Structure 1
Amino acid sequence: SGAIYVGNYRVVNRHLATHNDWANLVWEDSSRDLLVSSTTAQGCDTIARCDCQTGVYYCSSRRKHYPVSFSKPSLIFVEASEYYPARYQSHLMLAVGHSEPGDCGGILRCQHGVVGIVSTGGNGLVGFADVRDLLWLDE
C-alpha cells in the first residue's frame, strides 16, 4: 500500500483505490495502473520534473529503501494477476529489486522529488508507474 500526497491530490495504484477515492475521483487510467483523488488537507510530496534513471524506492516487505537504476517509461508486458489480465502497461519503468505482493504504492524518488510508485513485482524485478509527465499535479 502507499500513496503520493501532492497539493490537494492523493495518487494511488488504481487497483488499490478505496471507495472514498472513487467517490472523490480526479483522474484514473487502467493502462497505467494509476488513480488520483482529491484531499481536504494539503500534502508534502513534490513531484520530480526531470530525466533521472537512478533513484531510491521503498520496499514494505523489507522495511527498506533501495537505490536502483530504472528504465525509461515504456509500454511493457505484465503477467496476468488477480487485478489485471495479461496485458501491456504503459508509462512503466523496470528495475532489479525485490517487490512482492503488498509492495505496490511504495515511492520511487530521485534528487528532484517523487518519480512514481511501485506497480509490479516478481522475478527479482520491480516496476514503477511514472508520474513525472502529469504536470497538472503541480497546480
Structure 2
Amino acid sequence: SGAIYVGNYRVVNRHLATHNDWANLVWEDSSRDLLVSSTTAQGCDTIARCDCQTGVYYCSSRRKHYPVSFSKPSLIFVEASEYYPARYQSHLMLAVGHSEPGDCGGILRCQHGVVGIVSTGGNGLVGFADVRDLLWLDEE
C-alpha cells in the first residue's frame, strides 16, 4: 500500500483505490494502473520533472529503501494477477529488485522529487507506474 500526496491530490494504484477515492475521483486510467482523488488537506510530496533513470524506491516487504537503475516509461506485457488479466501496461518502468503483493504504492524518487509508485513485480523485477508526464498534478 501507499500513495503520493501532492497539492490537493492523492495518487494511488487504481487496483487499491478505496470507495472514498472513487467518490472523490479526479482521474483514473486502467492501462497505467493509476487513480487520483481529491483531498481536504495539502500534501508535502513534490513531483520530479526530468528524465532520470536512477533513483531509490521503498519496499514495504523489507522495510528498506533500495537504490535502482530503471528503464524509460514504456508499454510492457504484465502477467495475469487477481486485479488484471495478462495485458499490456503503459507508462511502466522496470528495475531489478524485490517486490511482493503488498509492495504496490511504495514511492520511487530521484534528486528532483517523486518519479512514480510500485505497480508490478515478480522474478526479482519491480515495475513502477511513472507520474512525471502528469503536469496537472502541480496546479489547480
Shorter-normalised TM-score: what interval?
A: over 0.9
Identity %: 100
User: Does residue 91 in structure 1 map to residue 91 in structure 2?
Assistant: yes
| TM-score, length-scaled by structure 1 | 1.00
Shift of 1:43: 0.1
Q: CA deviation at 1:80?
A: 0.3
Q: CA offset at residue 69 of structure 1?
A: 0.1
Which whole-Å deviations, capped at 9, do the CAs of 1:36-85 have from their partners, x for residues lacking one?
00000000000000010000000000000000000000000000010000
The CA distance in 2 between the partners of 1:115 and 1:105, in whole Å, is 12
Length, aligned pairs only: 139
In the TM superposition, residue 10 of structure 1 has moved relative to its aligned partner by 0.1
In 1, Cα distance between equivalents of 2:6 and 2:63? 23
Q: For residue 27 of structure 1, report the CA deviation from its aligned partner.
A: 0.1
SS in 1 for 2:61: coil
Rounded to whole Å, the distance in 2 between the matches of 1:21 and 1:13 is 11
Q: Deviations along 1:75-129, whole A, 9 cap, x unmatched?
A: 0000001000000000000000000000000000000000000000110000000
**CA shift at 1:15, angstroms?**
0.1
Distance 1:26 1:3 in 2: 15
**Equivalent residue, structure 1, for 2:66:** 66
How large is the Cα RMSD of the aligned pairs? 0.4
Deviation, 1:5, is: 0.1
TM-score, L = length of structure 2: 0.99
- Once residues 93 and 121 of structure 2 are traced to their aligned partners in structure 1, the CA distance between those partners, rounded to angstroms, is 11
Deviation at 1:9, TM superposition (A): 0.1
Gaps of 5+ in 1: none
How big is the shift at 1:17?
Answer: 0.1
Q: Distance in 2 between matches of 1:24 and 1:75?
A: 28
Once the two structures are TM-superposed, the CA of residue 3 in structure 1 deviates from its matched residue by 0.1
Runs of 4+ in 1 over 6 A off after TM superposition: none
